[PDB]
Write a protein that binds this ligand. Sequence first.
Ligand SMILES: *[C@@H]1O[C@H](CO)[C@@H](O)[C@H](O)[C@H]1NC(C)=O
Ligand SMILES: *[C@@H]1O[C@H](CO)[C@@H](O)[C@H](O)[C@H]1NC(C)=O
Lengths: 49, 49, 473, 49
Amino acid sequence: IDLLIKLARTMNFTYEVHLVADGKFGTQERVNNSNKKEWNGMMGELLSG
Amino acid sequence: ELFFRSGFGIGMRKDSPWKQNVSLSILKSHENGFMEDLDKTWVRYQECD
Amino acid sequence: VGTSDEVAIKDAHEKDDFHHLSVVPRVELVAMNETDPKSIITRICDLMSDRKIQGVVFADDTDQEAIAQILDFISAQTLTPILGIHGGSSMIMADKDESSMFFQFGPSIEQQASVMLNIMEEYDWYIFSIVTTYFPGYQDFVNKIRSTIENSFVGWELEEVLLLDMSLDDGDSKIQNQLKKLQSPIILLYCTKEEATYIFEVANSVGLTGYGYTWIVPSLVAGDTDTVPAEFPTGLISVSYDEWDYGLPARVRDGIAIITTAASDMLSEHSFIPEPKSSCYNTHEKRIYQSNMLNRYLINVTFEGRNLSFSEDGYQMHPKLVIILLNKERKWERVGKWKDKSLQMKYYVWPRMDDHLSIVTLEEAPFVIVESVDPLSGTCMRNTVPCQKRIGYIKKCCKGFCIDILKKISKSVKFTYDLYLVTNGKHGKKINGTWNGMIGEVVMKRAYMAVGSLTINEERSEVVDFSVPFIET
Amino acid sequence: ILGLQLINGKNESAHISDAVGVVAQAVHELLEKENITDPPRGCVGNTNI
Ligand SMILES: *[C@@H]1O[C@H](CO)[C@@H](O)[C@H](O)[C@H]1NC(C)=O
Ligand SMILES: *[C@@H]1O[C@H](CO)[C@@H](O)[C@H](O)[C@H]1NC(C)=O
C-alpha cells in the first residue's frame, strides 16, 4: 500500500482498493462440464474486468 | 568416496572348458574364510596410524 | 420392417397391467416394407386421417445408415412424439431440432467413450492411440477422452491422435502414410459400419493386425451380431447395446408403457389434454395447443421402478451395455457386462500372451515395497507396476530399488513381463531334496526369472545361474 | 449508421444463368469417365446410393 501511493503521484491516476472475495491467490481449475478451464481468485478477477 | 565400483576377476577366453569350475571355487572360498585370510596376511598389516 | 411373427408380438400387446390409471392403450400392429422415404411419408401422415392417434412408436431390423435422420424430420414438422426402439432408428445422431421431440433407446456417445477407459484400467493398457473419421459426433469422442486423461493419478500416455481424412480419390497412399504412424499396442477407432471395412483392408497390408495389436470399436461399427464381412481382425472387441436379454416383444411392451404414463399423467395436474388435429395439414393453425407442457415430464417416467429418463438430446440416461469379443469362428461372444457404473468381466486375465516372461518377487523394506491398489480408481498408480498375489488373486502395486532395475533393463533388452508375489516360502531353501520359494519356482519352470534380494552362493548356483551382481552384501 | 450491402445478391434472375454456366463444363468432363451410373429411379424403386 505504501508503494501504491508512490505510483499514483508519479503517474497521476486515482485508485480505490477492494479485497479479494474468496481469498485465494490464483490457479487454473477445470469446469465440471467438458474441459473448459478458468482462473479463480485474485488472478481470475483481473481477466474478468 | 568411491565413485566407480566394479570388482576384479579372472579373465578367460570364450568357449573355455574351465569357465564354470573357476567361478564355483571363488564362491566357496568366500564362505570358507580363505579369502578373508589372504587379506589378513598380504593386505591388512597396519604400519602407521 | 423385416422378418417377424405378427402373433408373437401381438401376444404381449394387450399385456400392460396399467389398472392404476385408465390409459386404455389401443395398440395397433402395423407391418409394411417401408424402407424408402416415399412409403414412410405416405403412411405416417395418413395414419392420423384414419385413426385418431397422438403417439407413434417405430421399430426396425435393418442396418440402414440414415433411417434415423429421415424419420426424425417428421418429428420436427409435427408435435407427435416418436421413439426409436430397434434397428437403424436407434442409431446415434449428433443433434436434434429444438422442435423435434424424438427419442431413442440406446447409449449416448459420451458413455461409450467412458466404458472403453473402464476396461483398459482393469487390464492395464495405459498406452493407446485414437483413429477417427468424419461423422456427426466425432468431435466429442476426442474431447471426452482428453478430459478424463487430464484429471487422473494413473499414468496415461497419448500419441498419434491423427485422423483419417479418406475423402479424396486414390486414398491408399494417404492412408498408408497416416496408418504407418501408429506404434501403440491398442488403437481406438470411431467410424461407420461401411467405412470400417475400407480402413481394415489397409491394416492387414501393413501388418499391424495380429498378436500384440488390439482394436476397440463402438457399437455402431459392429452393427450386426451375425453379418461378419470377414474383414474384421480376430480379437476385435466392441461394446454394444444388449440384445440377448432385450427381446423384440419386450421392447414394444416397455416402450408403450412410457408414452401411456406420460400423456395420461398430464391430466392429473393440467387436467386439459390437448387434442391436435388428426391430419397431415393445418399444423400452423393449431399452434394454440402447444406440447411443451407434455414434453416437460414425458421423458421422466417410471415403470415398476426404474430410471428411463432421456437426455435433452434424446438419449437414455441409464442404458444397459455388454462387451462382446470376436473369435476365430467369426462369431461374437459375450465377455463383459455393464450395469450402473459397474463392470463385470468374465476373464480375470486376458488370455492372449519369446517376449513374454514371468517374474517372481518378494517384499523387502528398501528394495521391493508393496502397497494396496488405489481405492478411487481401482487401478495401480503412477511410478508403480501392478503385481498379482494369490489368495482368486488380488492386484497390488510394487515399487522399489530392484523394480527400477527391471524397468530399465526391459527397455534396452526389449522384453515384456508380469510380476507376481510368491506364496510358498521365501528366498529359497532346500528341504529333503525340494526347493521352496523364489528359487523353488524357477527350478520348476514357473518363473523363468526372479528379481529381488537374492544372494549368490555355491548351493544355489548348481540349480540356477545368476547374473552380474549389482550390489554388495 | 454505417452498413453493408451485397450487389446482385437479391436479383434471383441474375444467378439462374450462373448456376447452369458452371455445371456446363462440369458435365463435359464427367462424360469421359468410366462407370457412369444413374441415381435411384423414383422415390420407391431404389433405397441405395
Ligand atoms: C495531473 O492530474 C491533474 C488532475 O486532473 C491534472 O491537472 C493533470 O492531468 C496532471 N497535472 C499536471 C501534469 O500538472
Ligand atoms: C568341473 O567339475 C565337474 C564335476 O566336479 C567335472 O565333471 C568337470 O570336468 C570339471 N571341469 C573341468 C574343466 O574339468
